[PDB]
């Protein structure tokens, strides 16, 4: 007989761009070394100066 607070969280995927998202945190920038950096969707291999 104990009660339950059923929570139904519906996440839409209609013809509207994403509005709610979680981050990918966190890392520190490293300079003067070969790092496979990722900058907000820009992915590349190189030395940062």
């Amino acid at each position: 007989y104990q009660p339950y607070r059923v929570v139904v969280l519906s996440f839409e995927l209609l013809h509207a761009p994403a509005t709610v998202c979680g981050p990918k945190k966190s890392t520190n920038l490293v300079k003067n070394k070969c790092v496979n950096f990722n900058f907000n969707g820009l992915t590349g291999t190189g030395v940062l100066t």
Binding site: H15, A16, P17, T19
Partner: protein, 45 residues
Amino acid sequence: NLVRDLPQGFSALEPLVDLPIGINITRFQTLLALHRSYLTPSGWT
């Protein structure tokens, strides 16, 4: 520096912001400011 017609210079017209509306769109219309009627001569415009 001109009066009525468009200027003659070249301007790079920078962005302001993007909006995620995602709706169809066909027609626009502008809004104008009309100081409402007073005792200065219906009187609009």
